Amino acid sequence: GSFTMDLVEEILRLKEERNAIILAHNYQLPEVQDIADFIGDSLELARRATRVDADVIVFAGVDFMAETAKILNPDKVVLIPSREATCAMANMLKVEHILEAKRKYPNAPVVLYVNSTAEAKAYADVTVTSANAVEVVKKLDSDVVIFGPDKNLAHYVAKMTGKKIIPVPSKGHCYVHQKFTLDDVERAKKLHPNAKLMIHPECIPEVQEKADIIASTGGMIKRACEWDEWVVFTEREMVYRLRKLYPQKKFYPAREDAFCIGMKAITLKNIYESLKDMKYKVEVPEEIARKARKAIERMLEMS
Ligand SMILES: C/C(=C/C(=O)O)C(=O)O
Ligand code: SF4
Ligand SMILES: [Cl-]
Ligand SMILES: [Cl-]
Numbered sequence: 399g400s401f402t403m404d405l406v407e408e409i410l411r412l413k414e415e416r417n418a419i420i421l422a423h424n425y426q427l428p429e430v431q432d433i434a435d436f437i438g439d440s441l442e443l444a445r446r447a448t449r450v451d452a453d454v455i456v457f458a459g460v461d462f463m464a465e466t467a468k469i470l471n472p473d474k475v476v477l478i479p480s481r482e483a484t485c486a487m488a489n490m491l492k493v494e495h496i497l498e499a500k501r502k503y504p505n506a507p508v509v510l511y512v513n514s515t516a517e518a519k520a521y522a523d524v525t526v527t528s529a530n531a532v533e534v535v536k537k538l539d540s541d542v543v544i545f546g547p548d549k550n551l552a553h554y555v556a557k558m559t560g561k562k563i564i565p566v567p568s569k570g571h572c573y574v575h576q577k578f579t580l581d582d583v584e585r586a587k588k589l590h591p592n593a594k595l596m597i598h599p600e601c602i603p604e605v606q607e608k609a610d611i612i613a614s615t616g617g618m619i620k621r622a623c624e625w626d627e628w629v630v631f632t633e634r635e636m637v638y639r640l641r642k643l644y645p646q647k648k649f650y651p652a653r654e655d656a657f658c659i660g661m662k663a664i665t666l667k668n669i670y671e672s673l674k675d676m677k678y679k680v681e682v683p684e685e686i687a688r689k690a691r692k693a694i695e696r697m698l699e700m701s
């Protein structure tokens with residue numbers, strides 16, 4: 399015919415030409431999810447980055463996630479389609495916060511949420527995500543741990559493990575998940591009285607306390623089989639992910655306006671441009687990468 403390739407067809411050809419895999423987070427735009435080879439949460443993306451047979455990883459997610467993939471694949475090309483795909487919560491944690499906490503608690507393990515920079519991870523004894531933070535902290539050989547950046551996840555970990563949690567920094571949080579309120583819980587239950595509530599641990603504690611399940615986005619997918627109707631208290635693109643996986647269930651956003659600007663820096667067009675031009679190359683300095691890798695590997699061994 400007269401027509402040629404659209405962006406999807408161009409991307410598919412370039413993936414072949416580059417020997418590339420596209421890894422996407424659950425918060426990516428639906429049309430980006432639809433072209434990804436693998437979609438998952440922070441822990442699943444970290445694990446998947448340890449079995450990459452491709453030469454090139456295009457990371458449809460934020461920069462810290464691409465850096466984690468690069469730390470696990472120092473000799474593969476890792477591309478981030480936009481350097482403005484970044485995480486507001488992760489940037490709240492600086493090396494100075496970690497050093498001050500280590501000074502006060504030298505025997506406390508430093509436990510850093512994967513939502514953190516590579517420089518910060520170089521000071522972690524182990525990394526965690528929302529899916530394994532409780533399990534990891536429970537198993538660490540200390541009754542006190544230094545933990546960050548997210549204070550709402552820290553609250554959940556403190557509740558579930560009974561251990562003393564020293565937050566770094568003092569007020570780290572995700573603006574997307576902080577948008578959920580008790581009024582959103584009330585409205586969701588009024589509009590969808592037969593639905594259960596799946597709530598991310600980055601939400602505030604009083605909202606966590608209303609959950610039927612508290613889970614990472616990966617845990618939400620794992621536990622969705624437990625009911626047929628769910629209100630989803632996380633970034634709104636997760637509703638698309640859940641509807642695609644389970645077309646027979648019903649999913650409703652807790653708030654349509656819970657959007658991550660950094661995640662939406664990734665577009666179909668800049669994924670195309672990323673493969674076409676081999677950009678933007680993600681690099682992590684060797685000393686930081688080796689130290690971060692030790693903490694990330696330990697995390698994968700512990701969960
Ligand atoms: C936002 C997020 C973070 C994580 O997995 O630790 C999630 O995908 O649940
Ligand atoms: S949703 Fe929140 S934690 Fe995730 S990248 Fe966006 S700002 Fe960061
Ligand atoms: Cl692969
Ligand atoms: Cl995220």
Ligand SMILES: [Cl-]
Pocket residue numbers: 644
């Ligand atoms: Cl199913």
Ligand SMILES: [N+]
Pocket residue numbers: 539
């Ligand atoms: N011990």
